[PDB]
Design a protein around this nucleic acid. Structure first.
Lengths: 242, 24, 146, 157, 121, 784
RNA sequence: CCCGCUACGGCGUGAGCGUCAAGGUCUGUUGAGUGCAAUCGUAGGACGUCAUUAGUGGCGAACCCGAUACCGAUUACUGCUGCUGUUCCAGC
RNA sequence: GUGGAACAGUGGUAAUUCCUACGAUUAAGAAACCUGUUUACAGAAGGAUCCCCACCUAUGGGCGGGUUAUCAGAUAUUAUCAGGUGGGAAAUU
């Protein structure tokens, strides 16, 4: 049984309304995820830190797992969880965590800044850290900021779905992922599929070979994909329930 | 009850009795 | 020490890239919609020429040098789109990662490759493939009877 | 137990409640497998729970095999049924009844049917949901060999 | 009163033994699925029509669960038969201080209803 | 890519499955180059490439055509006479044992001359030619005699003139060369008994002779080593007064009951050696015993051969009134085990008279079951020599295809006591077994009789009441070991034994395989699983200790496991002690019993026990452990043969109430025998340590028994296991093997009864040899 | 060969038995059992040897991989052990 | 004659160092692979206590009919899992 926790929602801003093609494309790519054979699906949604958070309770999540995906949950034989990655660069218009953690399940972040990495490791009780594997590396990865954050409990995430986008982006992808592997001490590595189309989904045998040749051993990879993934799912679930 | 029988396969058989014994 | 080679079973899956037409949600129906058919110009030499070009443009020259020592397609038929690639036991990682990065054929695009079964012998892989296809026939027959 | 499904359709049942599931077996499952309209059968329904007296239920089965009219030419079928861990007690009330019948130089013609409910429960973990399956035994007994019911899916005994 | 039990008669030929599983109460479900699958794989070599699944008592319910799995999910034709089982039990009849197992053993019969379940190929 | 229909899809995939199956079958057909590889692995013969006769007759023609497609010495003037002496000795021995007469004792001893043997064999034929009297004339053509020793032990048997100096040190089985060509045997006692078959038969004997239901076969053990004595009361012709007394002296009051007198079933139990010199009685645990009675008075007792010599010595000590009968070379049993053992056994024998025992045995032989039958099944009859058949044939009547327990109820009431006990009286007496050899024929003679039936008249030889050797045959059930044993005279066993496995679903057993069978049925074994008795402790401890010590000192440094430096074994590591509990090898019960008496002395000294800091003041554990190490260092110089250290408790708990001076080890410690099955991951091995769960973290082991898991969905045991102290040891496992009939690990352990009554729960943790993990399981009591 | 129908040899069931034949099969396969020939990868701890600039790093080799099992003999290499022979160096 | 160093010949003996954890499936045998969890039973086979109605007797109680709660060794879990993997020559026609 596997956990895929990095499927993006085709919307970036709350003012933009999701068209009928994007919902059908998301149903296509999640059926493609179930086609190769998966168990857990945690779809992701992207917000900016400069964006003004709404003061609502039942409107914080424009995902609606119950009314749309509640039929596919019964028909297909899977389940969905909602999660947010935080595109944080500067400490301004923010510092609110007591409300966004109760609505959603898993709280992630996207630091692209040097001080952003420090404020993510310091005062963000989040689950996973995501780096931009598409664009360039921000400054330099060190053991000092990583080892203090992995030992706290926050895991580092590698997006193997961003590699099947372009040709030139693959080089920067490998340069980012091998840097994450040499800085992570091969422990806190959770991998996820960032696919927007059904043409970019792969199975466990190819992805395990990918992460094995990029520099993570076969014990740590499979042990991570089972144990650490299903542990951070229960971490989010107990932050919800308790 | 293990497969590696030291006393049985050498000292106690009739084929390896001519060999020096395992107590010796 | 003999020739300890490993065989890899792969299957070509076509995702239903159609946003304008609606979709049905079922198990064996989506198995029908993904396991449709292979196109016309698909043979052994075409898949070998495509995978050598992907091996060149993705992994390079010396990686292709290590891979192409015992890189052959032993069995393939276009009616079921399942193939068996012989390789070394050390470069099996490289062959599976090359099978993963297969983006498109030069004639038909919009397809993914699924590496399913890896073993050091072809006789157990054929036995597992017959049982997997038997399970596929079970799912098809269960959705067809009801 | 989160929910009870029969034939992949959502149903409102409770496994700990015996009466509701026995009435669901009586009203829905048996008309879905046998039709009493297009023939001349007299079907007497009976369900068995694990709290039933064996002797009293066999004595109740002693009156249902001779209940309908003999002059109308109606063949008399007893449909006994149970589900899950009660079925074993059913089997006793089955076979002792056979022990009460074969000594008089007569025969029971028997048809068996096995289907299931699919219940949903929470597993060892909250994210892991278990699908358990509850078996159903339906037995149609009669003194006639050939019955015009749609009994092709059954098992002749 | 101390009483001990014995298993039941199994009258089997050369071909009936390799195609019959006897389901215990401590038998796991997935293990029973694996063994009936192995029997369906080997029944072509044994050359017979069905694989028999026999249970008595506490196993009967989960034995029926076997017939609830292969009939629907694998499209196998099953036959359900209800049989009687005679079991001999050694009981002690009171008639010094002796060890508990070494007393007067008297045989008593006891009938248990059970389920045979045949699975076709 | 284009969507297709459902029927076309399932037809294409089914055609692909059929094409792959046909391609695999064609590759399997093209892969074989000969039909010699078509044979199963059991029947493969290396000689079959040379000669054609090993191959089955259907396959020999293809073997002949593939073999055709693929394609008296110098001897001096002395060694020629040295070779002709042996040939003349063999010819004169054949003529002497064939014509009329028996064996001289001078030829039997074979320690004086061979020329005197030639002169004696020349003289006996001339004396038979010149005169009828003064001849020890036999009763048959084959060289069979009566090796029965009345009131004394049986000597070395005569056997054959050729293989006589090969029988100089150890004796042989009647199937000795037969077992030698097909099995690995060992020379341990005065016989040479089998150890294991040559082909690998661990899982094979486990599935066919085991407790598993899928046991479509039969397994035969040559159990001629088990020695029996026959005792009869000479004092009175009436009821046996001294028999019940001598049974109550040899055994406990457990095997001398009225039920065993009435129902006359054989009982196997525990015998203990008594010794009464003058007003004092000393009892030591001796071993296993099999007791059987004939209606009131005569008794056969059979058990282990060294224990047989000791019991025969004790019985010859007090031999005042009753006459003893030693039977080492005139009576032996073989053991059948499985589901179709009764069918093959009824296939091997035929009837000579219509009697009740034949009907009862043929009704038993059809049910294909063991435990549904009652406790008593002891059948006996008169049968034909099985050399009349010499072919695998089974005989079965119509019987209307019905098997019920109502026929089994007729087995408990209608028992033919008279004829069965008459066959018992025939086998016990030396005159009737001598009369049985009155018509024994040679293989040439039975071949000539088969040729006479082929000329006159079917594959049989008919029975004649005047000139056919009607044998006595006894087949009895043995209860706890779940196996049917059949007993017969010594020279009669081989015509029965040769026809057994020619039934094509019958294999032979080694004593290693017999130990596997006793391990599978939760039973016990005397050389290995009996450490409490004297001989078992001495044999097991000394031989396995010397063997493992030679094996450990033989290995070079840095390749074997190092017993000296193992870190993190117990919590609060004690000073001057860095090793494992007791001896690393074969189970030192001395360490366990001294540690148990030390903890008992600490509990008698104070309500609690301290952990750590001519005999020094005992206040904690390490003062006891240094005394253990000092006693081991003293007993490495001089061997211990004074007393035992660990008896059983199951005979002591019921009546003696298990009740237990500057003493540390004088009063021994009693144990009960348990069988513990693993609930956690792992398997046990030999010489395993059994601990107890402490007063703390009991709920942790209860939660691990209920369930502990990582969130992936599977079981988790990569956690900080709490380490108990050194003195929490409560037992030893002698035999540790992954139990294939349970799917887990079985360890035959022996735990203290006081420690058994300490914990209210039956949870027991196990630790292997040189491995620092602790594995939980649950035990059941072995009432053997 | 026993049961029922029919009666010139016949027919239907026993998941019955005996004989004969068939390149239809033999994972009926072994505390490893493949047969276009599996016998794995990684992490941590324990032990041994060798070299260090601060205390760690490297190594656990070589021969060879069966094809039903067993035993004996020969041949390829490492380490230990006893004996023999040779060379070099002294205690008086 | 002795002790140390080196070499050579023969005889005997051993070889994954050992342990621990992990390596996708309701499509229930995909870490490369094999075997195992089948002599079917909770002294629940006329099971035990208990509810209502009618009958007979009275100091206790029993029978008949109907719905039918509780109980079956750690008040629990029916749907998991374990073990092992090339050797002294398997080699040599």
């Amino acid at each position: 049984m596997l956990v895929d926790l990095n499927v993006p929602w085709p919307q970036n801003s709350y003012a933009d309304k999701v068209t009928s093609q994007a919902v059908n494309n998301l149903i296509k790519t999640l059926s493609t995820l179930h086609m190769l054979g998966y168990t857990h699906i945690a779809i992701n949604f992207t917000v900016n830190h400069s964006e003004k958070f709404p003061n609502d309770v039942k409107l914080l999540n424009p995902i609606d797992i119950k009314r749309r995906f509640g039929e596919l949950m019964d028909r297909t034989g899977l389940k969905l969880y909602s999660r947010i990655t935080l595109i944080i660069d500067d400490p301004s218009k923010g510092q609110s965590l007591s409300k966004i953690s109760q609505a959603f399940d898993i709280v992630a972040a996207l630091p692209i800044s040097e001080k952003g990495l420090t404020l993510s490791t310091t005062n963000l009780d989040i689950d996973l850290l995501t780096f931009q594997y598409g664009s360039r590396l921000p400054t330099f990865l060190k053991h000092k900021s990583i080892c203090s954050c992995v030992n706290r409990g926050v895991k580092l995430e590698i997006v193997y779905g961003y590699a099947l986008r372009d040709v030139q982006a693959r080089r920067q992808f490998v340069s980012n992922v091998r840097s994450v592997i040499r800085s992570s001490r091969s422990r806190g590595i959770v991998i996820g599929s960032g696919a927007m189309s059904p043409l970019e989904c792969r199975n466990i045998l190819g992805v395990t070979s990918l992460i094995k040749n990029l520099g993570l051993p076969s014990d740590r990879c499979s042990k991570a994909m089972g144990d650490l993934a299903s542990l951070v799912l229960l971490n989010g679930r107990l932050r919800n329930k308790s | 009850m293990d497969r590696t029988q030291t006393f049985i396969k050498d000292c106690l058989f009739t084929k390896c009795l001519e060999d020096p014994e395992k107590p010796f | 020490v003999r020739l300890k080679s490993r065989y890899i079973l792969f299957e070509i899956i076509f995702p239903p890239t159609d946003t304008n037409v609606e979709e049905s949600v079922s198990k064996a129906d989506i198995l029908l919609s993904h396991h449709r058919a292979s196109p016309a110009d698909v043979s052994i030499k075409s898949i070998l020429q495509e995978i050598r070009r992907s091996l060149s443009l993705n992994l390079g020259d010396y990686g292709s040098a290590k891979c192409n020592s015992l890189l052959q397609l032993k069995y393939f038929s276009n009616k079921t789109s399942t193939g068996i690639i012989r390789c070394h036991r050390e470069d099996c990682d490289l062959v599976i990662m090359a099978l993963m990065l297969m983006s498109k054929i030069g004639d038909v695009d919009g397809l993914i490759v699924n590496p399913v079964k890896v073993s050091g012998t072809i006789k157990k892989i054929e036995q597992f493939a017959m049982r997997r296809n038997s399970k596929i026939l079970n799912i098809i027959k269960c959705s067809q009877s009801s | 137990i989160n929910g009870v499904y029969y034939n992949e359709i959502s149903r409102d049942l409770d496994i700990s409640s015996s009466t509701q599931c026995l009435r669901f077996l009586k009203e829905t499952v048996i008309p879905s497998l046998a039709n009493n309209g297009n023939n001349s059968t007299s079907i007497q329904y009976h369900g068995i729970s694990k709290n039933d007296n064996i002797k009293k239920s066999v004595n109740k089965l002693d009156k249902q095999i001779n209940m309908a009219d003999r002059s109308l030419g109606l063949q008399q079928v007893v449909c006994i049924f149970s589900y899950g861990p009660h079925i074993q007690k059913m089997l006793s009330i089955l076979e002792i009844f056979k022990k009460g019948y074969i000594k008089n130089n007569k025969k029971i013609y028997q048809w068996n049917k096995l289907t299931s409910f699919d219940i949903k429960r929470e597993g060892r973990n909250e994210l892991q949901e278990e699908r358990l399956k509850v078996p159903i035994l339906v037995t149609l007994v009669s003194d006639s060999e050939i019955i015009d019911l749609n009994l092709h899916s059954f098992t002749k005994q | 009163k101390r009483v001990t039990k014995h298993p039941s008669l199994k009258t089997l030929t050369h071909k009936q033994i390799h195609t019959t599983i006897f389901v215990k109460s401590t038998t796991p479900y997935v293990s029973a699925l694996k063994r009936i699958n192995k029997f369906l794989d080997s029944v072509h070599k044994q050359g017979s029509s069905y694989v028999a699944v026999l249970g008595m008592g506490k196993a009967v319910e989960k034995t029926l669960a076997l017939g609830c799995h292969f009939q629907d999910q694998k499209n196998k034709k099953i036959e359900v038969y209800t049989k009687t089982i005679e079991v001999l039990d050694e009981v002690i009849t009171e008639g010094s201080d002796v060890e508990d197992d070494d007393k007067e053993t008297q045989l008593k019969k006891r009938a248990v209803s059970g389920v045979e379940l045949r699975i076709y190929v | 890519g284009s969507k297709l229909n459902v029927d076309q899809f399932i037809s294409s995939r089914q055609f692909e499955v059929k094409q792959l199956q046909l391609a695999m079958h064609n590759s399997k057909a093209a892969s074989s180059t000969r039909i010699f590889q078509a044979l199963p692995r059991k029947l493969r013969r290396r000689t079959a490439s040379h000669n054609v006769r090993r191959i089955p007759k259907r396959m020999r023609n293809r073997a002949l055509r593939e073999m055709r497609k693929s394609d008296a010495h110098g001897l001096n003037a002395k060694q020629l006479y040295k070779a002709r002496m042996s040939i003349k000795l063999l010819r004169l021995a054949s003529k002497s044992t064939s014509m009329k007469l028996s064996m001289p004792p001078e030829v039997t001893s074979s320690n004086c001359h061979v020329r005197q043997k030639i002169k004696t064999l020349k003289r006996m034929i001339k004396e038979s030619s010149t005169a009828n009297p003064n001849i020890k004339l036999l009763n048959n053509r084959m060289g069979s005699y009566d090796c029965t020793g009345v009131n004394e032990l049986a000597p070395i048997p005569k056997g054959r003139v050729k293989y006589t100096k090969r029988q100089k040190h150890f004796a042989w089985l009647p199937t000795h060369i037969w077992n030698a060509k097909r099995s690995h045997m060992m020379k341990r006692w005065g016989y040479q008994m089998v150890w294991a078959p040559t082909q690998k038969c661990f899982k094979l004997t486990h599935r066919l002779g085991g407790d598993t239901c899928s046991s479509d076969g039969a397994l035969c053990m040559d159990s001629s080593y088990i020695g029996t004595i026959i005792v009869k009361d000479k004092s009175n012709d009436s009821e046996g007064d001294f028999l019940k007394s001598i049974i109550g002296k040899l055994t406990a009051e457990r095997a001398n009951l009225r039920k065993y007198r009435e129902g006359q079933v054989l009982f196997q139990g525990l015998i203990y050696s008594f010794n009464e010199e003058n007003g004092e009685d000393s009892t030591k645990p001796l071993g296993p015993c099999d007791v059987f009675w004939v209606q009131k008075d005569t008794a056969i007792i059979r058990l282990h051969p060294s224990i047989y010599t000791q019991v025969f010595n004790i019985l010859l000590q007090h031999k005042e009134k009753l006459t003893v009968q030693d039977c080492r070379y005139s009576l032996a049993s073989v053991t059948l085990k499985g589901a179709k053992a009764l069918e093959s056994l009824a296939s091997c024998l035929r009837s000579t008279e219509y009697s009740k025992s034949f009907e009862q045995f043929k009704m038993v032989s059809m049910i294909t079951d063991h435990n549904a039958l009652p406790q008593r099944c002891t059948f006996a009859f008169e049968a034909i020599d099985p050399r009349h058949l010499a072919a695998p044939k089974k005989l079965n009547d119509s019987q209307r295809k019905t098997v019920n327990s109502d026929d089994i109820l007729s087995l408990h009431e209608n028992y033919p006591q008279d004829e069965i006990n008459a066959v018992f009286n025939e086998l016990c007496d030396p005159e009737s077994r001598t009369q049985s050899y009155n018509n024994q024929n040679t293989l040439k003679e039975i071949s000539a009789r088969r040729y006479k039936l082929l000329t006159a008249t079917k594959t049989t030889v008919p029975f004649k009441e005047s000139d056919d050797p009607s044998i006595p045959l006894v087949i009895i059930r043995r209860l706890k070991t779940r196996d049917w044993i059949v007993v017969l005279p010594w020279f009669w066993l081989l015509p029965l034994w040769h026809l057994l496995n020619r039934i094509p679903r019958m294999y032979h057993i080694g004593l290693r395989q017999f130990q596997q069978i006793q391990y599978e049925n939760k039973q016990l074994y005397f050389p290995d699983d009996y450490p409490f008795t004297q001989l078992g402790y001495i044999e097991n401890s000394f031989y396995k200790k010397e063997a493992s010590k030679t094996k450990w000192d033989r290995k070079p440094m840095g390749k074997r496991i190092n017993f000296e430096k193992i870190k993190d074994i117990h919590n609060t590591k004690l000073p001057a002690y860095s090793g494992e509990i007791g001896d690393f090898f074969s189970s030192d019960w001395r360490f366990l019993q001294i540690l148990r008496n030390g903890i008992d002395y600490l509990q008698r000294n104070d309500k609690t026990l301290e952990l750590m800091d001519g005999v020094r003041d005992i206040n904690c554990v390490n003062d006891v452990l240094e005394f253990c190490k000092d006693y081991e260092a003293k007993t490495k110089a001089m061997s211990l043969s004074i007393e035992e250290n660990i008896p059983v408790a199951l005979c002591k708990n019921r009546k003696c109430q298990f009740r237990t001076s500057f003493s540390l080890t004088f009063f021994p410690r009693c144990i009960i025998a348990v069988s513990c099955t693993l609930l956690e991951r792992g398997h046990p091995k030999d010489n395993a340590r059994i601990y107890q769960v402490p007063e703390k973290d009991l709920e942790h082991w209860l939660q691990l028994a209920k369930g502990v898991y990582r969130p992936n969905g599977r079981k988790d045991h990569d956690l900080k296991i709490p380490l108990p102290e050194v003195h929490d040891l409560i037992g030893f496992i002698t035999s540790g093997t992954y139990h294939l009939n349970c799917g887990n690990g079985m360890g035959i352990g022996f735990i203290d009864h006081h420690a058994a009554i300490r914990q209210p729960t039956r949870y027991v943790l196990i630790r292997n040899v040189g491995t620092n993990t602790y594995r939980l399981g649950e035990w059941s009591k072995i009432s053997v």
